[PDB]
Design a binder for this molecule. Structure first.
Ligand SMILES: O=C(NC[C@H]1O[C@@H](n2ccc(=O)[nH]c2=O)[C@H](O)[C@@H]1O)c1cccc(CO[C@@H]2O[C@@H](CO)[C@@H](O)[C@@H](O)[C@H]2O)n1
Ligand SMILES: O=C(NC[C@H]1O[C@@H](n2ccc(=O)[nH]c2=O)[C@H](O)[C@@H]1O)c1cccc(CO[C@@H]2O[C@@H](CO)[C@@H](O)[C@@H](O)[C@H]2O)n1
Ligand SMILES: CCCCCCCCO[C@@H]1O[C@H](CO)[C@H](O)[C@H](O)[C@H]1O[C@@H]1O[C@@H](C)[C@@H](O)[C@@H](O)[C@@H]1O
Ligand SMILES: CCCCCCCCO[C@@H]1O[C@H](CO)[C@H](O)[C@H](O)[C@H]1O[C@@H]1O[C@@H](C)[C@@H](O)[C@@H](O)[C@@H]1O
Ligand SMILES: [Mn+2]
Ligand SMILES: [Mn+2]
Lengths: 289, 289
């Protein structure tokens, strides 16, 4: 459940927070609209686990495995079993054009998987973009009745460390690993005013990655519907945004500020970018080709 | 309104947040349960004003002026007019045993004041403690229909700088100015196990001040009802907590973590404590005697 009467926390013994010591001296840990930016060292997972377990939280995880991408499912799901929301109720939703190609992965107690058959588009760009329509449609069909939060991710990835309830909030985006240190002028936002995803050179907070976003079912429905409708307007106007669904996600999150932002710990590519000092953990990473 | 469909923010030009620069290097700006700790330098007030104005936010401010404390109302209200939630809808609620002693203070547009007549208790301790019962009772009578958030403060104070929508959240407490740098063992929590306010030496996050707390009407109702019921149990058991309502507030906020914590900028005494380097602004301060 979300936003329902909360019982008291039990007695807990943990180190006292230190008012006169910053939790990080090397990174920004709160946005200018007072949303936490989630880095290792900012949170006590024991306190957060208590808070979310007492609310009997269920987390949905959506993933698309269309055409050749079914090959990524086995590693994705097996590593999710090790690292994603362990101890909490989880419902995996696998969107695929090939239900028979979904691997039989052994799941821990309180965790389930549903296969949702969808159509395959020819262009990889359309497969990617149409995730917004499909997620929005299923928010109405299944998600509202089955989960409290939705986490929407790319499939060609693996979990390598803890991804837990610290991410949960009404609306979150994730700092794209290629651009977290970049100035806004260098962000690869859509720059053509003819597109619904247009962002001028003097606007923008962060460059969010299309590969990892989420929130409450209500807020994810709103985001995905808005991005789908914007893409349809663009299509009618004969324009396709430079980075497809990610361009629209960035426009939406500029105009509707997320209530948490995840650090690049949560979306990384070690082959391309190595392992910088600012990342104490690499949690969710690209599978190398 | 709270938690209702939110329109898009307009185009805004402001400095880009800096991912690789901490907003403060001298203080903790987020709790271990990912609640912002509100200090100057953590927030862009222009973004926050937009977010809250678009929701047509109304803020209630409660203050008790019983017996001789009516003398503090003129300065309290005149300085609130200069500094508290300017630009937003405000409803002042003055609880008093002397309706005729309430000064005629000139209010800005969209701001109103109601006088609520209540009984006076003989002991200053009971006057202070019974605020919990009275606030809870009025949450049901007026507050649910009239305001979105409630801010509950001591009257023998004055505003000296901005106190705005940066504080608003479902539940907040404020770091007591006497103890923000203290270890938990030194906190003046209630230490007798016979009291409902009991906190052991190895528990506690912060020492919150009884003089400044608030949140959504729903969360304030819960807090004030819980503290009142706990005080009644103590009374039946022949025990009175060491710091009265503040002791119970601290027990409640230990077991129900606030969603924002205000720095001592928001609750200060310059005569007693001066003006430390960590305070860039002194916002709400004790009136000297
Ligand atoms: O990740 C990519 N696309 C976004 C997601 O879109 C889904 N997708 C994309 C194309 C596709 O044919 N099948 C598919 O399932 C997968 O869940 C992908 O993770 C992608 C596309 C092209 C090249 C690369 C290289 O990495 N990734
Ligand atoms: O602030 C005090 N009490 C908490 C609040 O309780 C209310 N109060 C307390 C005693 C009282 O007689 N009248 C009254 O209105 C006022 O709103 C106060 O701000 C207080 C009590 C005793 C001594 C001092 C010195 O400062 N303050
Ligand atoms: C600061 C110097 C500029 C250097 C920036 C290097 C990162 C580029 O990143 C790409 O960024 C694009 C947006 O501009 C899209 O998000 C694309 O999906 C992404 O590539 C994806 O994510 C990457 C991390 C890799 O895993 C790549 O194989 C993926 O296709
Ligand atoms: C670290 C060295 C220890 C030194 C600590 C000095 C601050 C003491 O503070 C008192 O703390 C009490 C709880 O323990 C109550 O909250 C009391 O209301 C408060 O006095 C109030 O607030 C004060 C700031 C003053 O304005 C005082 O006049 C008020 O009555
Ligand atoms: Mn990919
Ligand atoms: Mn006082």
């Amino acid at each position: 459940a979300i936003g329902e009467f909360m019982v008291s926390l039990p007695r807990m013994v943990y180190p006292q927070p230190k008012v006169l010591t910053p939790c990080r001296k090397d990174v920004l840990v709160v946005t200018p609209w007072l949303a936490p930016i989630v880095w290792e060292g900012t949170f006590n997972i024991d306190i957060l686990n208590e808070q979310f377990r007492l609310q009997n939280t269920t987390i949905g995880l959506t993933v698309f495995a269309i055409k050749k991408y079914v090959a990524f499912l086995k590693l994705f799901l097996e590593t999710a079993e090790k690292h994603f929301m362990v101890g909490h109720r989880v419902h995996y939703y696998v969107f695929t054009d090939q239900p028979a190609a979904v691997p039989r992965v052994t799941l821990g107690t309180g965790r389930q998987l549903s296969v949702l058959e969808v159509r395959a588009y020819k262009r990889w760009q359309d497969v990617s973009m149409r995730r917004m329509e499909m997620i929005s449609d299923f928010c109405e069909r299944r998600f509202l009745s089955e989960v409290d939060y939705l986490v929407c991710v790319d499939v060609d990835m693996e979990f390598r460390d803890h991804v837990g309830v610290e991410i949960l909030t009404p609306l979150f985006g994730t700092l794209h690993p290629g651009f977290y240190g970049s100035s806004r002028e260098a962000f690869t936002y859509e720059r053509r005013p003819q597109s619904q995803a247009y962002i001028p050179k003097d606007e923008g907070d962060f460059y969010y990655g299309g590969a990892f976003f989420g929130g409450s079912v209500q807020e994810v429905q709103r985001l995905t519907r808005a991005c789908h409708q914007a893409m349809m307007v663009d299509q009618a106007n004969g324009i396709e945004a430079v980075w497809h669904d990610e361009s629209h996600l960035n426009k939406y999150l500029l105009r509707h500020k997320p209530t948490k932002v995840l650090s690049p710990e949560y979306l990384w590519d070690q082959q391309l970018l190595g392992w910088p000092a600012v990342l104490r953990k690499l949690r969710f990473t690209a599978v190398p080709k």
